[PDB]
Amino acid sequence: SKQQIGVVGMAVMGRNLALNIESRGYTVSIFNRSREKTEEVIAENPGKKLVPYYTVKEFVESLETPRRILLMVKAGAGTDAAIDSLKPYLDKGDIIIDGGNTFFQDTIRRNRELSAEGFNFIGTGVSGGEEGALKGPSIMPGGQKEAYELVAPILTKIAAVAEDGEPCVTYIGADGAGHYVKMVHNGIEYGDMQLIAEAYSLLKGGLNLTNEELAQTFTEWNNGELSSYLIDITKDIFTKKDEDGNYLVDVILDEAANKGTGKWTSQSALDLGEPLSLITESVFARYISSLKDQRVAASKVLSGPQAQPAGDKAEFIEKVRRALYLGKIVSYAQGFSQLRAASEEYNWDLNYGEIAKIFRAGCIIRAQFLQKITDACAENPQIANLLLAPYFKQIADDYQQALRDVVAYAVQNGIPVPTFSAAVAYYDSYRAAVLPANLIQAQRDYFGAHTYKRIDKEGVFHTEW
Amino acid sequence: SKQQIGVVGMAVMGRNLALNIESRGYTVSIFNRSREKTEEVIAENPGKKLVPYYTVKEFVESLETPRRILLMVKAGAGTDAAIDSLKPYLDKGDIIIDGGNTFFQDTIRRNRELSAEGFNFIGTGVSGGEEGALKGPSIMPGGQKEAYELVAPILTKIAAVAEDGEPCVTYIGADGAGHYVKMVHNGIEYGDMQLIAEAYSLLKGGLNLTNEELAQTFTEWNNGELSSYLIDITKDIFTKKDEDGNYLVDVILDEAANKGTGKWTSQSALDLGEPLSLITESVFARYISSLKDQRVAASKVLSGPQAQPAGDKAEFIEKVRRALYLGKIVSYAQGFSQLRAASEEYNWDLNYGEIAKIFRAGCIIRAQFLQKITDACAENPQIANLLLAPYFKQIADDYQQALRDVVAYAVQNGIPVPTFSAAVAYYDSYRAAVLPANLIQAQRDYFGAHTYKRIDKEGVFHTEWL
Ligand SMILES: O=C(O)[C@H](O)[C@@H](O)[C@H](O)[C@H](O)COP(=O)(O)O
Numbered sequence A: 001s002k003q004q005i006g007v008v009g010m011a012v013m014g015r016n017l018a019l020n021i022e023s024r025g026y027t028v029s030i031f032n033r034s035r036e037k038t039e040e041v042i043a044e045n046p047g048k049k050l051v052p053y054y055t056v057k058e059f060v061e062s063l064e065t066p067r068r069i070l071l072m073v074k075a076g077a078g079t080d081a082a083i084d085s086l087k088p089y090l091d092k093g094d095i096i097i098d099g100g101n102t103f104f105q106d107t108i109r110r111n112r113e114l115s116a117e118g119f120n121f122i123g124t125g126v127s128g129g130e131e132g133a134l135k136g137p138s139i140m141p142g143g144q145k146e147a148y149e150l151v152a153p154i155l156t157k158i159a160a161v162a163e164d165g166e167p168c169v170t171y172i173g174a175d176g177a178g179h180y181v182k183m184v185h186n187g188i189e190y191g192d193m194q195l196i197a198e199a200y201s202l203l204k205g206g207l208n209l210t211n212e213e214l215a216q217t218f219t220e221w222n223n224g225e226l227s228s229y230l231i232d233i234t235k236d237i238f239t240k241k242d243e244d245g246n247y248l249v250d251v252i253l254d255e256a257a258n259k260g261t262g263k264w265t266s267q268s269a270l271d272l273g274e275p276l277s278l279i280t281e282s283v284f285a286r287y288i289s290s291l292k293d294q295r296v297a298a299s300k301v302l303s304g305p306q307a308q309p310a311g312d313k314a315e316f317i318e319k320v321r322r323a324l325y326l327g328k329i330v331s332y333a334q335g336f337s338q339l340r341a342a343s344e345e346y347n348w349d350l351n352y353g354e355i356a357k358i359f360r361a362g363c364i365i366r367a368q369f370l371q372k373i374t375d376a377c378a379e380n381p382q383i384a385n386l387l388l389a390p391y392f393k394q395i396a397d398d399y400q401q402a403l404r405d406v407v408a409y410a411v412q413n414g415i416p417v418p419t420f421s422a423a424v425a426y427y428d429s430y431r432a433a434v435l436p437a438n439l440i441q442a443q444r445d446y447f448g449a450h451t452y453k454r455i456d457k458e459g460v461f462h463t464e465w
Numbered sequence B: 001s002k003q004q005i006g007v008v009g010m011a012v013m014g015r016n017l018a019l020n021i022e023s024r025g026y027t028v029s030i031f032n033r034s035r036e037k038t039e040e041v042i043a044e045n046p047g048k049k050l051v052p053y054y055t056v057k058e059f060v061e062s063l064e065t066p067r068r069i070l071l072m073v074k075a076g077a078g079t080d081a082a083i084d085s086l087k088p089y090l091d092k093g094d095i096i097i098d099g100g101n102t103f104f105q106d107t108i109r110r111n112r113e114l115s116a117e118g119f120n121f122i123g124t125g126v127s128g129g130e131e132g133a134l135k136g137p138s139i140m141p142g143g144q145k146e147a148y149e150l151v152a153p154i155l156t157k158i159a160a161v162a163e164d165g166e167p168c169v170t171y172i173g174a175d176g177a178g179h180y181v182k183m184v185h186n187g188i189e190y191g192d193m194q195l196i197a198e199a200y201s202l203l204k205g206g207l208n209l210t211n212e213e214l215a216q217t218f219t220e221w222n223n224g225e226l227s228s229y230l231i232d233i234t235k236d237i238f239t240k241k242d243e244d245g246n247y248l249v250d251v252i253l254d255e256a257a258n259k260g261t262g263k264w265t266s267q268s269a270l271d272l273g274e275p276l277s278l279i280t281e282s283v284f285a286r287y288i289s290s291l292k293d294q295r296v297a298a299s300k301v302l303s304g305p306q307a308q309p310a311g312d313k314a315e316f317i318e319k320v321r322r323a324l325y326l327g328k329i330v331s332y333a334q335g336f337s338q339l340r341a342a343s344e345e346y347n348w349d350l351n352y353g354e355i356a357k358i359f360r361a362g363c364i365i366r367a368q369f370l371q372k373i374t375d376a377c378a379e380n381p382q383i384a385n386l387l388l389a390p391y392f393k394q395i396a397d398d399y400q401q402a403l404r405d406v407v408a409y410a411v412q413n414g415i416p417v418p419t420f421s422a423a424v425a426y427y428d429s430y431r432a433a434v435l436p437a438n439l440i441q442a443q444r445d446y447f448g449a450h451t452y453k454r455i456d457k458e459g460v461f462h463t464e465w466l
């Protein structure tokens, strides 16, 4: 008896995906380069249809052809070592699926090299954390279309499901398109977290809300248009008490770590010519949080204002709420515009509405908000920027003054609001028919003879200034 | 006879650097892959000690040994190919100076390869635009110290001199350190241009200043602490007209181009963990300017506010001036902190005070401002961040209210100020002993069990938040 799919890598993510697959009725082969972890998975999951293998050869031979092998191992050398360990036993047409958080260019390279050896390769993002991997993640696969069609029945069964019942998996595109989309999802997640962090700074610093008041605030926001997994868990965090009866969030060291996808999304915006200011400022905010020794030293030297009178409490809370929602809109408009630039550069012909649809559940950024994006893409598939969609244009019309008031209040109060500030600058720059780049171009021609174009005549010009 | 030095690359900077060298008395061999450009240089410079060559072999053979060859070719494949074409004709001991805007990692690789092959190599930045190349640029050389000493005399002859007479060239450090410092100079340049552009948007948006009034404003600012080449040329640009009487600044298409070093500085900050927000936002501002068709379309459908009352004209102009100066201070604090992170990462032991010193003249960012940086670094060579130096701390104390007032005004008026607003966010974040990253760490522990640290006990912790 052979299995339809096998999982290599029994750390928590691989183990949980194996259990998710097993829960849909499949018998699953499992293997780990270290036998101990495999033994542990078997001991902890009695009665489950997991079949453990202890050599790569036997693991590969246990699979029906074309083989479907899901790799959940360490990124980098561990992924190439896993692939190389499987190669001698594979047949032409077999399919290797890398579900790690791999940089997309590495997937493009692996896909091309393996294709020349006769093997298919699907690089797929998996979002949702350990719980999502076990119960229903958002899955973002890229690679050969026919290989995707051969694994789609399994992926659709294990994926999270949206409100309308659609599985949160779709064929993203060729080669590294799936890992590129996972990277952008992580960039967007960084932005959403930083936007929420600024809302917290404003509420605590401007109104002095207690943690119970913050939890109540985020609870109410989660009942409206901002409904999202990140806002929902934030209300839980502000409720959590530590032993001494005090809140846990207040003793956590304020140094935000990262595993690359945030930095990668911004480096890609820079390569592509995309103005991804919000997510990039979110990466820089984690970086400055990690310079805690310098911040503490600076705090003893540098001066600034203190919080200004906030005015009516309910009114201030509603302005921050509006600022947060419009800030999200701007961040996603920048991210989806980057998906378009990437699609063009890497020749993926991405379907933006289908991408938004699989972000409606399973992934970390899940929110009803993704349905508004799905809707905008449905009505205009090649929309250049989400800000132009009717729903978003109307929210900007109605909420921009609150965002402006929040930023002006924060700047006068000494409260840092990098992403709310970036949201306003982007909105005011994108809608400006004329920007001061005319002076920049004049300067470049003056000092470096770089030439410029004119608004009233075709051609390139150089002036002897 | 043989020439003392040769230059490959007759685009603007290379041709002018060859003329600079010739003006110090040397006879210079020149070569360009597009041979018609070499002919043009000769036809346009009769009587100068330039000797044109039309094959690489003859160009190399024309040089006195050990040979000195300065390459000023387009970055990338062009430079790689130029250097590969020279090799077969060279002798051990010859000296290759890459003065192009080469990515620093390419230089690190090339420096080891060429040195192992028996050549002396210097990867150097050259800054100054067309006029500084001709008259005296800032020069930032890296490589082995022995190689630097072989070219230090000629580079000292052609470099700009500061007002105090010190040459704007110094040994930067090993391998790719000189090209890295050149890259950072270009990032700072992007920042300074964008800060000036925002001042322009504020003066025009808030006071509706005419081009003549803009020129008068920048002229007055140039006579004070903001004195700089970029402000000096800006005051000229605002009064320049074309033959039909149009002010050039109003007919030039607002799509800012770029050749990479600005993008590279920001990609390096992202790799090094540095919060380089102002320069990075300046790069993104050039990118959004390039989406001209999109902006013109959006301007017809998205709504926004009108400019708010600016108040007393002189007071508004002074607040914008203070905001521009403090914004420059923040941008340079970010840039110099990145130089320290890069020095640590790539093992260069950079001398920050000496770098600031060679930027006092020659280069595009030249300004009396650089003397303040030089002084701060001379007093505290390993200062972590310039904002902490007495002079800069005092300016932050005195000018931050103007900068906060200008950003609030702009935001209420719908005038985009990405770098002024990034400056405030950075200042308020850098001085914050506690940031909301505690909530970010709690969220990451919640959805990804990433663990967190505590302020009251040792170790890493994981929590069941529900
Ligand atoms: O989508 C997900 O399920 C997560 O985003 C995951 O892919 C990521 O690796 C970390 O959980 C957060 O990213 P950072 O570690 O960089 O904060």
Ligand SMILES: O=C(O)[C@H](O)[C@@H](O)[C@H](O)[C@H](O)COP(=O)(O)O
Pocket: A444, A447, A448, B101, B126, B127, B128, B129, B185, B186, B189, B257, B258, B259, B260, B261, B262, B363, B364
């Ligand atoms: O230092 C200099 O002399 C200039 O910076 C020089 O290197 C050139 O003018 C660059 O091309 C400008 O940078 P961008 O072309 O990217 O605007």
